[PDB]
A paper describes a structure:
ATP synthase is a molecular motor that converts energy from a membrane electrochemical potential into the high energy phosphate bonds in the ATP molecule, which is utilized throughout the cell to sustain its life by hydrolyzing ATP to ADP. Chloroplast ATP synthase ([name]) from higher plants has a unique redox switch that serves to modulate the ATP synthesis activity. The [name] enzyme actively synthesizes ATP in the reduced state, whereas the oxidized form has a low activity. Our cryo-EM reconstructions showed a complete view of the enzyme complexes, composed of α3β3δγεabb′c14 subunits, in different redox and rotary states.
One sample without DTT or IBZ treatment was taken as the control sample. As prepared for the functional measurements, three different protein samples in detergent micelles were imaged: reduced (DTT), oxidized (IBZ), and control enzyme complexes. After iterative 3D classification procedures, the reconstructions of three different rotary states were categorized and determined in individual groups. Although the density maps generated from the control dataset could be categorized into three different rotary states, they were generated at relatively low resolutions (5.2–7.9 Å). One explanation could be that the control dataset was composed of multiple states, conferring a greater conformational variability in the population and thus flattening out the high-resolution details.
Numbering used by the authors:
A (entry chain g): 157 to 208
B (entry chain a): 23 to 244
C (entry chain e): 3 to 131
D (entry chain N), G (entry chain O), H (entry chain P), I (entry chain Q), J (entry chain R), K (entry chain M), ...: 3 to 81
E (entry chain I): 29 to 62
F (entry chain J): 85 to 111
The structure:
């Protein structure tokens, strides 16, 4: 689970019995730096063929 | 010189190559018994050298035959160890201060007689495999891939152990004559890296030879 | 020539320019007005726009660039005005990324450490500029 | 002596051109083989055995030419 | 003077090969030990 | 030169092979 | 002796150029074959058997030229 | 003897250059064919039969040159 | 005999260079043809018939040179 | 006989170099033509007729050189 | 002296062409090997050992040709 | 004098072709090595030591050929 | 004079072919090295030292051939 | 005069082939160097000094061959 | 006359091979230089001056070889 959103970060925090990759924090007015951060996390975790 | 002390016992037989053979086999069994004399679960000091050696042996044997590694792991290890033995023997052998009767004695693989011996062993082991596992009637000699594919295989099967002996004999006599002519031309300081590269190739040729032999062995298995 | 620097949200610099020079995937190419046609992708690196007065570098974090006829559609992955970065803060962050790279094991995490080492390295690079 | 002369010149030309060509090709062998084998830095030793077999297959021809040169030089049975 | 070439390379190779191959063998033994 | 020294060394190699097989590589 | 002289020089030129060319080509063989076979690092042993068959097909011509050289050198039936 | 001399030198040049060229080309054959056949690692055996047919088509010329060399060496009907 | 001598040397040079060149080119043929035919692994057999026709078109020249060599060697009507 | 000698050597050089070059080029023909024709795997048979016409246009020169060789060998009207 | 003359010229041609070809190929070796090894700047020393083994495999042929030259120059047993 | 004549011509051909080939290959070495080493502009000095070792490995053969030329020119022990 | 004649012609052929090949290769060196070194316009001077070392490694063989030519021309100890 | 004849022909072959090769390579130098240096149109003058040094390193061999030609032509100390 | 004969043949070989090589390389120069200079269509005239300097550096060797040919043809001081 690539986790964006804080209530959802809580939803997987309270719901902790599954794989969650990284809690990306919530950012209304989505910052391109933040999207680059989550995107680079996904890009490495996809270059990593682990999750397909 | 291209001569050797021919002993006669019914034919002229160069005693020098056989004397080098006796010496190499002697040092082989001596280190083999000093290693295999004290067995240990956690392997003994220097016994781990022989252990990793036989590990690589059975490893490459699994790599090239696979399962029937252990059917011929002894034969392949015999080949490569004796060949690397004669290789490093001709490499390190101070073997000329005692001049023999008609020729000196440093390594027996310098005699291509030894190359013909080991390569005939290779081809005959291929025949034993291709007659035992494969069909005795239809060995690889059976022209499987085309009806026209008979005589190319007939040439190639001969060419296999022939070139096997040829390459190894040339490598051995090459390094020998190289060090000989180099010590002939200049003093002892010059030929050291030449012999270093020859020793680099020395185990390399034995390894490649055992590799191609077990390639033909996995082939006769196949 | 129309240098349109555009992140996929913010058109960073649609400033049409006189000259430019930057680091592509090719690595180094100066932009002379009306060279024959090409569209390119950039490495993560600064972008020295040599617009008529100022050789103006801008911290691009990669992206692509359609260099049309006097029209540089720079579609950057990210892009900073290289003066806008605090150079000491970008250097502290690049040191942080380098420490994160030395520490960062893992295939994905180490590769990301390398990628952001390039990103923060370009950031510190144009932060010097 | 002219037969021995031409046996000598024969062995010279034989060993010379035989050691010219195949070692040059073995250089090309070493070149792009080790280039690739270092590009993928994983399986170098597994590649190295086949590489050594290939290098020996290269050098065997030079061994054969040197063998013919030694047969014409030392134990010349043609002259 | 023939083998006086080979002697020095034999000494240096025995030294270096002793070091590295004993490192290899003892590494394998300590691995099996662990 | 291909004399009968090749068959003699072939005998030497075969005996040493089976012997050293059962000697070391067995043990 | 001149017939034996030319048989000797014949065997020299034969073995020399025959061991020049095909081993060089076998070097090219080894080169880009092992380059690719290491690029896809999976099926190296499956490739290796066909590679060995190819290398033998390369070396057979040098074997044939060396055979002609031995027939002219040792058991020369032309001279 | 000069006719037999030139028949001998003839067979030498024939076998030498005939075994120079086509085996080198068969090396190029083996090279980029096996490079591709390992790139797509699926259909290697299906490729291998046509590859063997191609290698035989390469080697047949060297076979023909060796045949001419044997006809000039052993059963020389020109001299 | 000199006419028969030159007919013999003629057949030697003919068969040698004729079997040098076209088989080398047929090696180049086999090379990049089978490289592509394995890249697209689908239509190999459909390609194989045209490939065989091409290989025969390559080998026909070597066949012609060997024919001229046999006509000069066996049934020499020039000498 | 010297005129017949040079007619023989003439036919040798003619057939040899004439069968060297164009079959090598026909190999290049076969190569990149069949490479493309397998890349687009659709229209292979439609390509194959023009390919055969092209291969015949390649081989016709070797046919012409072999014709000149046969005219100098068998029905030599110059000597 | 003519036998010693040709032994001298033999050693000259041998050493010259033997040191022409393989060192040129070793240059090609060094070229694209070090080009790639610097492209991936990580595993240079691990590549360097195999690179040195490859360079030695290149230089061994020139060593062999120089050995034949020294045997013909200094301890000439053919003349 | 003819032995000294051929020793002189020997040294000429030796030094000439030995300095022809390997320096040309060292040019190819310098070429694509420095091309890559400037493409990645970081590790030039670390590359430069191995580059110098490679250039010396190239030049050693020309050194050997010049050594043979000096031995035939100045201290000619063959003539 | 014939020994001096051949020493002169020796030095001519030596210097000529020795200055033919390696400077041509040094041209190839300069070519793709400076092509890359200008592509990445940063580290030109750092590249330039290794480039100069490479160019000297190229020119040393021509220096050696010219040295042999001067030894045969001026201080000819063979004639 | 024959020694002076061969000194003259020597200088001819020397200057001819020495001015053949390296200037051709310097053309290749100029080619891809200036191609890249115009691709990145910034640092042309900074590239130009190293380019001139490279061109001089190319031309020095032709200078050396012309020097040997002038020494054999004008102040011929061999003849 | 034989000295004048060889001076004439000297000038022929000199001018011929000297005008063979460097103009061919200048063709390679013109080729990829103008290819790039038209790819970036901006700075053609600024490139053109260095291009002309490079072309002159190419042609100077052919000028030198023609100079040696004129010195051997017209004002022959060797014969």
């Amino acid at each position: 689970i690539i986790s964006i959103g804080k209530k959802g970060n809580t939803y997987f925090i309270r719901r902790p019995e599954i794989p969650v990759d990284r809690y990306f924090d919530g950012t209304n007015l989505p910052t391109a730096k933040e999207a680059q951060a989550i995107a680079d996390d996904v890009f490495s975790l996809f270059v990593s063929e682990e999750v397909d | 010189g291209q001569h050797f002390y021919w002993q006669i016992g019914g034919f002229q037989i160069h005693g020098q190559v056989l004397i080098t053979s006796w010496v190499v086999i002697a040092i082989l069994l001596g280190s083999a018994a000093i290693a295999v004399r004290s067995p240990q679960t956690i392997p003994t000091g220097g016994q781990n050298f022989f252990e990793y050696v036989l590990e690589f042996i059975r490893d490459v044997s699994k790599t090239q035959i696979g399962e029937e590694y252990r059917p011929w792991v002894p034969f392949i290890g015999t080949m490569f160890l004796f060949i690397f033995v004669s290789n490093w023997s001709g490499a390190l052998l101070p073997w000329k201060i005692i001049q023999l009767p008609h020729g000196e004695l440093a390594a027996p693989t310098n005699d291509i007689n030894t190359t013909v011996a080991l390569a005939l062993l290779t081809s005959v082991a291929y025949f034993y495999a291709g007659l035992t596992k494969k069909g005795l009637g239809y060995f690889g000699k059976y022209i499987q891939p085309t009806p026209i594919l008979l005589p190319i295989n007939i040439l190639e099967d001969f060419t296999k152990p022939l070139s096997l002996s040829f390459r190894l004999f040339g490598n051995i006599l090459a390094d020998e004559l190289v060090v000989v002519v180099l010590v002939s031309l200049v003093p002892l300081v010059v030929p050291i890296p030449v012999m270093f590269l020859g020793l680099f190739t020395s185990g390399i040729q034995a390894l490649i030879f055992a590799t191609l032999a077990a390639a033909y062995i996995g082939e006769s298995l196949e | 020539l129309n240098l349109c620097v555009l992140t996929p949200n913010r058109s960073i610099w649609n400033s049409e320019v006189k000259e430019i020079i930057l680091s592509t995937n090719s690595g180094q190419i100066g932009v002379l007005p009306n060279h024959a046609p090409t569209a390119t992708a950039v490495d993560i690196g600064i972008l020295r726009i040599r617009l008529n007065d100022q050789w103006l570098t801008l911290a691009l974090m990669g992206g692509f660039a359609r260099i049309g006829n006097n029209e540089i559609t720079i579609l950057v992955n990210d892009a900073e005005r290289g003066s806008d970065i605090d150079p000491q803060e970008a250097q502290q962050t690049l040191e942080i990324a380098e420490a994160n790279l030395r520490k960062a094991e893992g295939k994905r995490q180490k590769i990301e450490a390398n990628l952001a080492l390039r990103r923060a390295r370009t950031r510190v690079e144009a932060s010097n500029t | 002596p002219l037969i021995a002369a031409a046996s000598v010149i024969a062995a010279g030309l034989a060993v010379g051109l035989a050691s010219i060509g195949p070692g040059v090709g073995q250089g090309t062998a070493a070149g792009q083989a080790v280039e690739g084998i270092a590009r993928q830095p994983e399986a170098e030793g597994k590649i190295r055995g086949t590489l050594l077999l290939s290098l020996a297959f290269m050098e065997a021809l030079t061994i054969y030419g040197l063998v013919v040169a030694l047969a014409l030089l030392f134990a010349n049975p043609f002259v | 003077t023939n083998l006086i070439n080979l002697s020095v390379v034999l000494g240096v190779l025995i030294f270096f090969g002793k070091g590295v191959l004993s490192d290899l063998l003892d590494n394998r033994k300590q691995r099996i030990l662990n | 030169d291909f004399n009968l020294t090749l068959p003699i060394i072939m005998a030497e190699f075969l005996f040493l092979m089976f012997a050293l097989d059962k000697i070391y590589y067995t043990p």
